[PDB]
Write a protein that binds this ligand. Structure first.
Ligand SMILES: Nc1n[nH]c2cccc(Cl)c12
Length: 118
């Protein structure tokens, strides 16, 4: 059965390499698809800098920091928050990046996270 949190190492992708630039067309769909890709090992992370979000597709799925002393086993505790037309669905901490499908792009790094499944 599902533990509340799972340790994952996410590939960090450069925005110009990403082939599939979002998870879907509604807040509920992108959160659902992001969770499925995380379970399947087919999710990447793009770090947000100027110019990144306009090169990706809304709705966005962000991973955000969920606490301050929980970095168990070297993995930052995180949760999912979606954004569409400037409104956020969830409230959480600082953004670590934006999640996208991973379809074989070569990463530049890995980001260790402890992900709250729901
Ligand atoms: N990463 C995940 N492994 N297993 C899951 C089940 C539900 C939701 C998620 Cl995100 C996961």
């Amino acid at each position: 059965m599902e533990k509340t949190h799972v340790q994952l190492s996410l590939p960090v992708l450069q925005v110009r390499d990403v082939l599939v630039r979002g998870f879907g067309d509604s807040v509920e769909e992108v959160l659902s698809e992001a969770r499925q890709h995380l379970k399947d090992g087919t999710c990447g992370l793009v770090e947000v800098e100027k110019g990144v979000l306009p090169q990706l597709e809304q709705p966005y799925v962000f991973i955000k920091r969920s606490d301050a002393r929980t970095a168990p086993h070297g993995h930052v505790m995180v949760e999912l928050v979606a954004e569409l037309e400037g409104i956020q669905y969830g409230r959480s901490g600082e953004t670590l990046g934006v999640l996208v499908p991973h379809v074989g792009e070569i990463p530049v790094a890995y980001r260790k996270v402890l992900l709250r499944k729901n």
